[PDB]
Amino acid sequence: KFYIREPPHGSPDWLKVGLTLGTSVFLWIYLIKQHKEDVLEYKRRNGLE
Amino acid sequence: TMMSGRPGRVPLQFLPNEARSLPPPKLTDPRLVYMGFLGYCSGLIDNAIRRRPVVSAGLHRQLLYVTSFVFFGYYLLKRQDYMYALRDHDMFAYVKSHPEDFPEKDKKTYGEILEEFHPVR
Amino acid sequence: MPLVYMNIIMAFAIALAGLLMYRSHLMSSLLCLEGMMLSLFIMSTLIILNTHFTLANMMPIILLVFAACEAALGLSLLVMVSNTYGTDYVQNLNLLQC
Amino acid sequence: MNPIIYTTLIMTVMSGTMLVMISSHWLLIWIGFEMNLLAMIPVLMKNFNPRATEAATKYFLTQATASMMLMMAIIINLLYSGQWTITKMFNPVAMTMMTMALAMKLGLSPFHFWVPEVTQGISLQAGLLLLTWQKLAPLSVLCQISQSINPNLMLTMAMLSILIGGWGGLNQTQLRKIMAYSSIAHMGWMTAVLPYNTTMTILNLLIYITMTLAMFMLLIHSSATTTLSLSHTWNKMPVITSLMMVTLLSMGGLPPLSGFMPKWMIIQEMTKNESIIMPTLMAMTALLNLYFYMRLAYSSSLTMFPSTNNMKMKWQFEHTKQMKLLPTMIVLSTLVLPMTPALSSLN
Amino acid sequence: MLKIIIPTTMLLPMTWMSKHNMIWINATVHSLLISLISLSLLNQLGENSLNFSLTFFSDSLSAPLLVLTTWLLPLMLMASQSHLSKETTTRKKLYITMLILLQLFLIMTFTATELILFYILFEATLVPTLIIITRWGNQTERLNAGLYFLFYTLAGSLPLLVALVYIQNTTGSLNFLIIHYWSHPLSNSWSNIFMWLACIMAFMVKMPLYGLHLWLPKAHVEAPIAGSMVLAAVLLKLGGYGMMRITTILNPLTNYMAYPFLMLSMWGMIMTSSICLRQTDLKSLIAYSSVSHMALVIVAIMIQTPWSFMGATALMIAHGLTSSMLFCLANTNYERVHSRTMILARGLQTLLPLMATWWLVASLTNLALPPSINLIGELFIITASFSWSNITIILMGMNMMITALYSLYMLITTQRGKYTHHINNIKPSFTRENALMALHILPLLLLTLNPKMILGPLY
Amino acid sequence: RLQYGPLAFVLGERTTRKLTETSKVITVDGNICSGKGRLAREIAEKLGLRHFPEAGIHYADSTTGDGKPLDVQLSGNCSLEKFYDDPKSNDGNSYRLQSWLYASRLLQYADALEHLLSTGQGVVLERSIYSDFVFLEAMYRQGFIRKQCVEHYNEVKKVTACEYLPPHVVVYVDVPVPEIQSRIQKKGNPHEMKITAAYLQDIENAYKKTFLPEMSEKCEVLQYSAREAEDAEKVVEDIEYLKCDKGPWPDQDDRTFHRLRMLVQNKLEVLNYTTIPVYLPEITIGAHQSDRVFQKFTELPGRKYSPGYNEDVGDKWIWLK
Ligand SMILES: CCCCCCCCCCCCCCCCCC(=O)OC[C@H](COP(=O)([O-])OCC(O)COP(=O)([O-])OC[C@@H](COC(=O)CCCCCCCCCCCCCCCCC)OC(=O)CCCCCCCCCCCCCCCCC)OC(=O)CCCCCCCCCCCCCCCCC
Ligand SMILES: CCCCCCCCCCCCCCCCC[C@@H](O)O[C@H](CO[C@H](O)CCCCCCCCCCCCCCC)COP(=O)(O)OCC[N+](C)(C)C
Ligand SMILES: CCCCCCCCCCCCCCCCCC(=O)OC[C@H](COP(=O)(O)OCCN)OC(=O)CCCCCCCCCCCCCCCCC
Ligand SMILES: Nc1ncnc2c1ncn2[C@@H]1O[C@H](COP(=O)(O)OP(=O)(O)O)[C@@H](O)[C@H]1O
C-alpha cells in the first residue's frame, strides 16, 4: 500500500472489463456475419454465384 | 435538396432493400482501416486526457473504440456507395431519355480542327 | 382583400413597432408583445371563419394558450429583474456587452 | 435546481426541437419553437446571478419577437393560399417575414448582438447547449423552405454574419464572447450555402457542432472563461492545451484539418452555380476568424505565461468528473478530411 | 511512392516508442536510409513521367525536389539535437514529430497528381512550420513572424482554391496529365486575366515576389535552425514548382500578363542585393540573398522558355543546398556567442580554421562560381533572358556583381580581421558541426559532376 | 450510484436523512501558542467527533498520494521559520505563506464538510477559513505585506468562502498577550521566540473586534479563558446544551445539501479561484521556474500518472484498468 487513500481505480472493474470485451467480440462477429450475408445476397441478386 | 423527395424513397431508412444488389465494402477497405485508425487515436487521446499510460493502459477500452469505429464506418461506407450508385443510375437514365438534350456529336480530327498558334518569344 | 384585413395587419405592425422601440419600462414592452398576439388571433379567426375551414377553428385557441405561456414567462423574468435592480427599467440590463 | 427538473427541462427542449423537425404543419412547427424557448429559459437561468437573469431576459425578448413575426408570416401565407403544409411559401411578403424571423432566431446579422451578450451571461454548459441545439432547429426549418428563399436577402445576411463575426472576435478577450462570434461566422457560412445545397448546409452544421462541442468541453475541463485563466492551463494539464490548439487550428479552416472540408465543399458548390465574388470574399474574410483563433492559441499553448503559487496544490489534485465523448469529438473535429465523400451518405 | 511515404509514417511511431537517449540516433539513421531509398526516383524517362498510380506520379522536376527534402531531414535533425539539449523527452519527440510531418507533407506535395490534392498538401505544410517557428523560436518576434508568414501565404492561396474549383467545374478534371493534353488557349478577357492573377499570385507570394516578401526575413530570422533550413531549402521551392506546373493552362495570356512580375522581379533582385550590402544581421543577409535568387527563378519561369526552365530547376536545387549550409554556419556562430550581429565576432578564421574553410566554400557557391550548379542555373536563366531582351543582361550583370560583393563582404567581416578580445568562450568546432557542413557541401559538388540530374524535364 | 452524483440523488440519498442532529461543525480559535489544540482534541474525543489538526503547510501533501510530505520547493515554496526570522523579506515570502495557508485551510474545510455530509459525524477543526484573516491583518498593520496583497486576499476569500456553510460552534480561547509570550519562551522554539509583542496584539485585536462580532450574528459563540479551557468537561457540557435555530443549517434542504456535497467532493473546483491571474510579484512565478518545478513534481514517484496507474509504486493490471 502506497497511497494514504484508496484510489478509485485501485482494482479493475471486472464487470466493466467483461462488458467491454463481450461488446467488442459481439460487434466483430456480427460484422463478419453481416459481411458474409451481404456478399451472398449481392451474388444471388446479380446472378454471379 | 437534389435526391430528397426521390420517388419511392422510404423515410428514415438508412439503407433500403435496393442497396443489397451492390458489392459490399471489403473488410480490408482503406476507408475501414482509416476508421479503425481514428478509433485508435480516440483511445490514445482518452488515455492522455485521463492521465493513464497512453499506449499501455485501457486495452479493452481501446479495443472497443476501434471496434465501434469500424462498425459504424462499414455501415457508413455502404450508405455512401449506395447513394453514389443511385446518382449514377439517375444521371444515365436521364441522358438516355433526353437525346435532344444530350446529342452525339461528330468527331473531327486535329487535322481538320483549326487552332491558332501563339509563339513563345 | 377587404379593408378589415388591412386594419388588422396595420394594428399588428403598430404593435410590432411598439415592442421594438423601448422607452423605460419592460412592462410596456410586454403589453406590446401581448397586443401582437391579439392581432394575430383576430386575423387568423377572420381568415378561418371566412373560408369555412372548419377544422382550423381550434388554431386560435392554441395561439392563445402559447400567448399566455409567453406572458407568464415574461412576467417571471420581470419579477426577477425587479428583485435584482429595484425597478423594471431596461437601462439596468446593461451588464453584458456586445 | 433539482436534477429531475433539470433533466425534464432538457427533455422538453429536445422535444420542442424534434417537434419542429418532424412536423408537417406550420402550427405544429410554431408550437415546437414555443416549447423550446419556454423550456430553454430556466436552463439559461440555472445558476442564478444578475448576469444570467439579464441574458435570459434578452434571449426571451429576442425569441418572442421572432416567434411573433414567424406566426404573422404563417398567417399571411395561409391568407393567400389556404395551405398549412410547410412547403414553398406562396406570398413573397410572408416569405420575407419568415426569413427575417428565422434569421433573428439563428443570430444572423444584423440580428446578432443577443448571441454574444447571452453567451457571456450564461455558463459554459448553457452556452454549449444554446449554440448547438438552438442553431439546429431553425436551420431545419430553413432547409425545408429553402426553394423559396430570396437569394439576395439570404446571401446579404450571410455575408454580414461572416464580416461581423470576424471583427467582433478580433476585438474580444472573453472566451465565451469569442465562441459566440465564431458561431455567428459559421452560421453565416451555412446560410450562404443554404439556397444552393441543403446537403452542404447540413455538412457544415455537423462539422461546426463537433468542433464547438470539443472546444466548449475543453473549456469546461480547464475551467477557463477568460484568456488569462486559460493561460495557466499549461502548468496543470498541458495535454488539454495541445488539444485546444489543434481544435482552434481546425476551426480556422486550415488544411488538412476537418474545418477545411465545409469551406471547401461550400466554395465548390457555390462556384458550380457561377458564384465567384461571393466565395472569394467569404474565403478571404475567414482570415479574421483565424487571426483571433491564433491569438488565443499563442496564449494557451505556443507560449508559457506566468503561473501562480497555488498551482502546486492544483498539481497535487486530480480531475474527478469525466467528460463524455470528448476524445471522440476531438478526433472527429480534426481528422475526418479523408472521409469527405460521406456527404453523399448525408444527402 | 508508397515505398517512400510509408517509411516516414513509420518514422513517427519509432520516434515515439524509442528510448529517451536513442531518439536522435534512430531518427537520423532511418532518415538517411529513407533518403537512400528516395535516390531511386532519379531514373526518369525521356518521353513521359513515372505514373505510379492514380494518385502519385514523379517527373524530372519532382524527383530532385523529393531527393532534396529527404536528404534535408537528417541535417535538420543534427542541428536540432545541437540546440535542444535541455528540452524534455516529450518536447524533443514533438519536435521530431513536427519535422517528420513536414517531410511527409512535402513528399506528397511534390508527388501529387491533381492540382487540388497538391493545394491541400501544400497548404497543410503551413501548420508544422508555424508551430515550429512560434513554439521553438528564441526571440520575442517569433509570434509576429508566424502571423506574417501564415497570413501572407493564406491570403495568396485562397483565390487559388477558388480558381481551381472553378477550373474543375469548367473542364471536368484537375489531373495534371488531362489538363496538359486537353489544354486550350486562354482568351484575352477580364475573367481570364483574373483567373491568371489568382493562380500566379498564390504562387508568387509563396516564392516570394518582391513587394510580397517581408514575411521571409521575419520568419527566417526568428525561426529555429531547423525551421530556417526547411523554410529556405524546400518551402520556397513550392512556389516555383507550382508555377512550373500551372502555367500549362495560362497560355497565351502569360505573354501579356508577365510584364509587371518580370519588372518587379528584376528590380527587386537588384534591391535585395543592395539591401544585403548594408545588413547588420547575418540571418537577415542570408534571407535577402534567398529573396534575390528566387526573384531570378521567377524571371525564368515567367519568360518560360526551355532554356529558362532548366536554369530555374538547377538554381532551385543549388539555392536550397547553399542557403541551408549558410544558415547552419550562422547558427554555429550564434551558438558560440548568443547573438546574430555580424560585427560582434571577428577573427573566427584565426580561432576556428576548418569553419573558415567551410565559410569560404559556402560563400564561393553562394555567388555563381563555375562550374557549380548555381552558376549553371544562373547562366541558363541569363541566356534565356538575353534572348528575351537585351537589357536583361545589364540587370543580370549588376545583380551578379552585387552578389559577389555582399558574399565576400560577409566572409571578410565574420572570418578575417582580428578576433574580438572579450569573447573567450569560442570552443573548438564539434565533429557534429563539421559533419553537417560536409554533408551540405559534398552533394553539391557531386551534382556539379553530374548536372543532367537536376535540369528538369526540358533537358 | 457507486459514486455520489445526480444519479444517487434521483435514487434517493438524502443528507437530511443521513444526519443525526449531532452532526455539528465546531472550530476552536485562539492566539498564537494557546491551548486550542488540546481543547480541540478533548472536545473531539468526548463528543465522538473527528479531529482536524490545524492545516499548516503540507496538509495537501498529507491528504494526497502517500501521507509523507513533499519538498518545500514543490509544496508551498514558503517558510514559517523564514517568516519569523525576516518578516519583511524582499521575495514576498510572508504573503506567499499567507496565501498558501489560506488555500490549505480552504481545502481542509472542504474535506471536513465532505466527511460530515457523507458520514453524518461531526468535525472539530483547529482553525477555519473564517479565522484566517486575522494573521493577514496582523501582517498588514505591522508592514509585513502590502495593500495589493490584502486586496488579492480579500478577492480570493470572497469568491471562495462565500460558498460554504459556517461552523455551528465557535469556541474562542482568550489568553492575555504576556501569558502568550511567557508560554512561547517556555516552549523554547527560537523562531516563535522571535515573535514581537505588536504582532501578537494585532491578532488579538482582529479576533476581538472583527471575527467574534462577525460570527456572533450567525450562530453560537463560546469564549473561555486558560482555566476554563483546561477543564474540557464543562466545555463539552456547554456544547451539548446549546439551543439555536437561527443558523443556515436548518434552512438547508436536500437540494442545497446535494449542491454543497457536489462542490466539496471535487477538490479542483474547491481550489478553482485560488489561482486567479492577479500578478502580484509575491505569488507570480515565471515561466521557466514554473516549468522546472512542474517537471520535478511529475518526476516524483507516485505523481506521473493517476493514482491507480503508477507502475513504479506497485500498481498491477494497468492494461485492464
Ligand atoms: C505518432 C504519430 C502521430 C501522427 C499524427 C496522427 C494523429 C495523432 C495521433 C493520435 C493521438 C496520439 C496521442 C495524443 C496524446 C499523447 C500524449 C503523450 O504524452 O503521448 C506520449 C506517449 C507516451 O508517453 P506516456 O509515457 O504514455 O505518457 C507521457 C505523458 O503523456 C507526458 O505528459 P506531459 O505532461 O509531459 O505532456 C506535455 C506535452 C503533451 O503534449 C502532447 O500531448 C502532444 C500530443 C497531443 C497533441 C494533439 C495530437 C493530435 C490530435 C489530433 C489533431 C490532428 C493531428 C494531425 C495534425 C496535422 C497538422 C499538424 O505538452 C507539450 O509538450 C507542450 C508543448 C508542445 C505544444 C505545441 C505542439 C503541439 C502539437 C500538436 C499536434 C501533434 C500531431 C502529431 C501527434 C503527436 C503525438 C503522438 O506516446 C504516444 O502516445 C505515441 C503515439 C502512439 C504510438 C503507438 C505505437 C504502437 C506500437 C507500434 C505501431 C506500429 C504501426 C502500426 C502497424 C504495425 C507495424 C508492425
Ligand atoms: C422490418 C423492419 C426492419 C427495420 C430496420 C431499420 C430500418 C432503418 C431504421 C433507422 C433508425 C430508425 C429511425 C431513427 C432515425 C433514423 C436516422 C437515419 O436512419 O435516417 C437516414 C439519415 O442518415 C443520415 O443522414 C446519414 C448519417 C451520416 C453520418 C456521417 C455524415 C457524413 C459526414 C462527412 C464526413 C464523415 C467523417 C466520418 C464520420 C464518422 C435517412 O433518413 P431520411 O429520411 O432520408 O432524412 C431526411 C432528411 N433529409 C432528406 C434532409 C436528409
Ligand atoms: C451509438 C452509441 C454512441 C456512444 C454512446 C455511449 C457514450 C457514453 C460512453 C462513452 C464515454 C466516453 C468514453 C470513455 C469512457 C471511460 C469510462 C470507461 O471505463 O468506459 C468503459 C467503456 C466500456 O464499458 P461498457 O459498459 O462495456 O461499454 C459498452 C456498453 N456495454 O468504454 C467506452 O465507453 C469507450 C468506448 C466507447 C465507444 C466508442 C466511442 C463512441 C463512438 C462510437 C462510433 C461512432 C463514431 C461517430 C460518432 C458520431 C456519429 C454517430
Ligand atoms: N495565517 C497564518 N500566518 C502565519 N502563521 C500562521 C498562520 N496560521 C498559523 N500560523 C502559525 O502556525 C502555528 C500554529 O500553532 P499555534 O497556534 O501556536 O498552536 P500550538 O500552540 O498548538 O502550536 C503558529 O506558530 C502560527 O505562527
TrEMBL record, chain A:
Keywords: Electron transport, Membrane, Mitochondrion, Mitochondrion inner membrane, Respiratory chain, Transit peptide, Transmembrane, Transmembrane helix, Transport. It comes from Sus scrofa. Coiled coil: none annotated. Accessory subunit of the mitochondrial membrane respiratory chain NADH dehydrogenase (Complex I), that is believed not to be involved in catalysis. Complex I functions in the transfer of electrons from NADH to the respiratory chain. The immediate electron acceptor for the enzyme is believed to be ubiquinone. This is NADH dehydrogenase [ubiquinone] 1 subunit C1, mitochondrial. Complex I is composed of 45 different subunits. It is found in: Mitochondrion inner membrane. It is a single-pass membrane protein. Its main location: mitochondrion. GO terms for cellular component: mitochondrial inner membrane; respiratory chain complex I.
UniProtKB/TrEMBL annotation, chain B:
It is found in: Mitochondrion inner membrane. InterPro entries: NDUC2. Its main location: mitochondrion. It is a single-pass membrane protein. GO terms for cellular component: mitochondrial inner membrane; respiratory chain complex I. It holds the Pfam family NDUF_C2. GO terms for biological process: mitochondrial electron transport, NADH to ubiquinone; mitochondrial respiratory chain complex I assembly. The chain crosses the membrane at residues 61-77. Belongs to the complex I NDUFC2 subunit family. Accessory subunit of the mitochondrial membrane respiratory chain NADH dehydrogenase (Complex I), that is believed not to be involved in catalysis. Complex I functions in the transfer of electrons from NADH to the respiratory chain. The immediate electron acceptor for the enzyme is believed to be ubiquinone. PANTHER family: NADH DEHYDROGENASE [UBIQUINONE] 1 SUBUNIT C2-RELATED, NADH-UBIQUINONE OXIDOREDUCTASE SUBUNIT B14.5B. This is NADH dehydrogenase [ubiquinone] 1 subunit C2. It comes from Sus scrofa.
TrEMBL record, chain E:
Core subunit of respiratory chain NADH dehydrogenase (Complex I) which is composed of 45 different subunits. It is found in: Mitochondrion membrane. GO terms for molecular function: NADH dehydrogenase (ubiquinone) activity. Residues 112-401 form the NADH:quinone oxidoreductase/Mrp antiporter transmembrane domain. InterPro entries: NADH4_N, NADH_Q_OxRdtase_chainM/4, NADH_UbQ_OxRdtase, ND/Mrp_TM. Its main location: mitochondrion. It catalyses: a ubiquinone + NADH + 5 H(+)(in) = a ubiquinol + NAD(+) + 4 H(+)(out). Belongs to the complex I subunit 4 family. The chain crosses the membrane at residues 21-41, 61-80, 92-110, 116-133, 145-167, 193-216, 223-244, 256-277, 284-303, 309-330, 351-369, 389-412, 433-449. Its EC number is 7.1.1.2. This is NADH-ubiquinone oxidoreductase chain 4. It comes from the Eukaryota. One of its GO terms (cellular component) is mitochondrial membrane. Keywords: Electron transport, Membrane, Mitochondrion, NAD, Respiratory chain, Translocase, Transmembrane, Transmembrane helix, Transport, Ubiquinone. The lineage of its organism: Eukaryota, Metazoa, Chordata, Craniata, Vertebrata. It is a multi-pass membrane protein. Residues 1-109 form the NADH:ubiquinone oxidoreductase chain 4 N-terminal domain. One of its GO terms (biological process) is ATP synthesis coupled electron transport. The gene is NADH4.
From TrEMBL, chain F:
GTP 3 binds at C33, S34, G35, K36, G37, Y84, Q98, R105, R127, D132, F135, E192. GO terms for biological process: mitochondrial electron transport, NADH to ubiquinone. GO terms for cellular component: mitochondrial matrix. It is found in: Mitochondrion matrix. InterPro entries: Deoxyribonucleoside_kinase, DNK_dom, NDUFA10, P-loop_NTPase. GTP 1 binds at C33, S34, G35, K36, G37, Y84, Q98, R105, R127, D132, F135, M139, E192. Mg(2+) 2 binds at K36, E54, E126. SUPFAM superfamilies: P-loop containing nucleoside triphosphate hydrolases. Mg(2+) 3 binds at E54. Residues 26-239 form the Deoxynucleoside kinase domain. Keywords: Electron transport, FAD, Flavoprotein, GTP-binding, Metal-binding, Mitochondrion, Nucleotide-binding, Phosphoprotein, Respiratory chain, Transit peptide, Transport, Ubiquinone. Pfam families: dNK. Mg(2+) 1 binds at N31, C33. Its cofactor is FAD. Belongs to the complex I NDUFA10 subunit family. Complex I is composed of 45 different subunits. This a component of the hydrophobic protein fraction. Accessory subunit of the mitochondrial membrane respiratory chain NADH dehydrogenase (Complex I), that is believed not to be involved in catalysis. Complex I functions in the transfer of electrons from NADH to the respiratory chain. The immediate electron acceptor for the enzyme is believed to be ubiquinone. This is NADH dehydrogenase [ubiquinone] 1 alpha subcomplex subunit 10, mitochondrial.
